[PDB]
Point group: C3
Chain length 141, copies 3
């Protein structure tokens, strides 16, 4: 997963970002058994007067966009659950701190993706489980 | 709509950005009566020697990328019209100020999107018309 | 092609960025005769404690994402070749300098794309060849 989180400048401390990125990572570890290192979260500070909503600056706004590469979600129920779980992980840092926020996901081709130069193994394969156990990309054939 | 506009550092004043984001919002309001707050425009300043076109730094270049989430464009005619209107709104700020520029759009899944933790209502629904009237996301069932 | 390259602060000098974007550009020029100016590379410096991998800051990490707009890659072999050649161009600047790195591609619709306000010509068309030779969008 590839997460971008656009925030007001200095909204989050390093400890905040660690805790939030840990919560996001736990989504994929708990629900999909993904290797932890698949989960990338990029925090991007946005100065005042750079984020515009409906033609007006919103300096109290967190905008989230992510790509899902590793898996495709095939049912309405699973797709709704992903959005629900995402909101649960985010709420302590965003909603409950008074920010406005919005989030969307795109699904991108699994075969156009490399990590440390390696082709990630098939979903739910024994090799994927090994990558998850050691939490690193291990060369294989 | 989710717009990213990468510009040279200090290309636009806060007033420029408000006027441009307003022009962008008007595309969607005028043609379909979309809720205004669906339209997000993110301005990102890029310092010199960070944007490379054909292998050479171009410090006079505005690159625009957007996601369409709320609606799909189903005919060639509508898709061409969208690009035409986009160029019209952009021209006073970009082309006419001597910038080089390029723009593209991706369409992403409508059902993997939440605003203020809420599921946006169906297109052309009474609830969508209410969201547009109040220009706020209102909880519903 | 639309490339975003996220790096640790001050990882690359202007000369580094010039050479790397030239290498990336050579992919499309050499293999498909794409117009050079189609290839855009954006470098984004990321300060310490802004890139998190598996819940921990990785301050030694280069993340690459690109969109392919102009054409689609229709076979497994071509799609694999693209990733292989990309890794080859990147290695002298990233892998060989000791960074961790990751890359992925999305394919976006050809007909929702304009450059200098113009409709790009059809792939492999006579007009595309003129755009490539002059390396600029020629009204037509
Ligand atoms: Mg896409």
């Amino acid at each position: 997963p590839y997460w971008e989180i656009f925030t007001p400048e200095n909204a989050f401390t390093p400890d905040d970002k660690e805790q939030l990125s840990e919560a996001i990572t736990s989504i994929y570890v708990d629900y999909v058994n993904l290797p932890r290192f698949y989960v990338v979260v990029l925090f991007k500070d946005m100065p005042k007067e750079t984020m515009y909503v409906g033609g007006k600056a919103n300096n109290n706004f967190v905008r989230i966009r992510l790509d899902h590469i590793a898996r495709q979600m095939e049912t309405a129920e699973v797709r709704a659950l992903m959005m629900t779980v995402a909101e649960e992980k985010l709420a302590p840092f965003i909603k409950e701190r008074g920010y406005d926020w919005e989030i969307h996901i795109d699904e991108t081709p699994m075969d156009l993706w490399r990590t440390q130069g390696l082709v990630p193994p098939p979903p739910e394969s024994d090799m994927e489980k090994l990558w998850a156990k050691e939490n690193r990309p291990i060369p294989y054939d």
